[PDB]
């Protein structure tokens, strides 16, 4: 299968036609996506199979073929880019200044950009092109707008 670094669509043929259920990042031979996209199930890349390696429902993350490799973090000050890969549409970079999710266990950056559910797993990048987290786990606020956490894993 394709092992080249980059952003990929996660598709299924189990619903009507071919449907995009999410997105993920291939880096250092490991595929990274959000748990809610695949529910930890195995994936196909051409004729090759990608088996789950690590996952956590509370973090809402999963890696395939190896351990989670993404370790860059939002600096808390600078604008970032969401590399949105929406269903049926070309990959497009959107620049924004994150907001913050404040929790009892600490603060996390958050991006206030609204895209269809099948965009979940799209990467958020810093100015060096490093992936600082994945888009698609968040909340709906007072005015009806969606705000995603910048969800990042831990490189062991």
């Amino acid at each position: 299968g394709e092992t080249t670094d980059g952003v990929y669509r996660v598709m299924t043929r189990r619903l009507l036609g071919s449907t995009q259920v999410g997105v993920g990042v291939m880096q250092e031979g490991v595929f990274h996506t959000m748990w809610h996209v695949t529910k930890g199930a195995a994936l196909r890349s051409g004729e090759g199979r990608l088996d789950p390696y690590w996952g956590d429902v509370k973090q809402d993350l999963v890696s395939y073929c190896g351990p989670w490799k993404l370790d860059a973090a939002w600096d808390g000050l600078s604008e970032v880019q969401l590399l949105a890969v929406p269903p049926g549409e070309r990959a497009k970079n959107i620049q924004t200044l994150p907001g913050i999710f404040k929790t009892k266990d600490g603060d996390i950056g958050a991006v206030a950009l609204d895209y269809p559910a099948g965009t979940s797993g799209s990467p958020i990048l810093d100015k060096c092109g490093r992936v600082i987290g994945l888009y698609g786990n968040g909340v709906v606020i007072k005015n009806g707008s969606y705000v995603s956490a910048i969800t990042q894993g831990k490189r062991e």
Binding site: T38, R44, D126
Partner: protein
């Protein structure tokens, strides 16, 4: 059986479209990985 298809390189784009606000929200994260607004 889910399958993956490449959609692009991961790179910062100069002069990309700039949008979105920066809300500061109090939130809670449950054992099922769902966030909720705390008010």
């Amino acid at each position: 059986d889910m399958y993956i298809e490449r959609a692009g390189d991961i790179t910062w784009e100069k002069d990309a479209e700039v949008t979105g606000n920066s809300p500061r929200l109090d939130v809670a994260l449950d054992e099922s990985g769902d966030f909720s607004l705390v008010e």
